[PDB]
Nucleic acid binder design. Structure first.
Lengths: 100, 99
DNA sequence: TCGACTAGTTAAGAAA
DNA sequence: ATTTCTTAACTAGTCG
């Protein structure tokens, strides 16, 4: 039926719907990502490559970011800033921005 | 999911089909105004192309393409189309009956 | 409910 | 990116 992702943190896992997530970014903690949800961030163990491979909507817009295409509100290609439905934003690399 | 890209110079804003009530031509040549639930967006496009996108986008009038999904009611005598967000547009005599 | 005569207006291609 | 020129095609109103 539904499409969800398991975010693992040690003995925890938190379960979240694909489109509950705006984007992922790499954490300052090695081997952890930050899922940016509608109204809170979640830190968890994962890799951006694997996440981008999950679904066509998850696109590697930047070495440090995988964005959920479904939650992109707008794109400024000059500045290469991607804005999301929840008012957050991230940055896109020069090479990848046009292909979002 | 079905969404549309509204292009403003280097900007593009991305909006879901049914977030949009209708489009109207702007006073600025070659621009349209997308009427959303709680905001209007000006952008470059043509009504013909938009009406071709989907069966729900119907050219009810030379200056308007309406999203059938968001039509609340229709007064055919006055030829006024009302939308779920409490605004309206007009339909041309020829096209009103075919909405 | 329909055409049909009029007169004023505009969408969108080209092109700049 | 935004505009100028262009005109076929549109529009509302009227009248029957």
């Amino acid at each position: 039926s539904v499409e969800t992702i398991e975010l693992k943190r040690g003995s925890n896992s938190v379960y979240v719907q694909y489109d509950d997530i705006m984007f992922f970014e790499s954490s300052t903690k090695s081997h952890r990502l930050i899922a940016h949800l509608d109204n809170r961030q979640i830190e968890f163990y994962g890799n951006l490559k694997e996440l981008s491979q999950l679904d066509d909507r998850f696109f590697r817009c930047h070495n440090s970011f995988v964005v959920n295409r479904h939650n992109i509100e707008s794109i400024d290609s000059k500045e290469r800033i991607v804005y999301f439905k929840n008012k957050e934003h991230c940055y896109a690399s020069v090479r990848n921005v046009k292909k979002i």
